[PDB]
Amino acid sequence: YMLFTMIFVISSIIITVVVINTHHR
């Protein structure tokens, strides 16, 4: 619904970068 909902993708962006970081230090 184009506000709050977006945070769900925010979560994934961060976590994704966090994965890549944890693996490829």
DSSP-derived secondary structure for 1-25: --SGGGHHHHHHHHHHHHHHHHH--
User: Determination technique for this PDB entry?
Assistant: NMR
- Of 22, 21, 19, 1, which Cα lies nearest the Cα of 11? 19
What does the block give as tokens for 12?
């994934």
| Cα 19 from chain centre | 9
- Of 3, 16, 11, which Cα lies nearest the Cα of 24? 16
Instruction: Tell me how far apart the alpha carbons of residues 11 and 14 are, in angstroms, rounded to a whole number.
Output: 5
- Of 2, 3, 5, 22, which Cα lies nearest the Cα of 14? 22
Instruction: Tell me how far apart the alpha carbons of residues 18 and 20 are, in angstroms, rounded to a whole number.
Output: 5
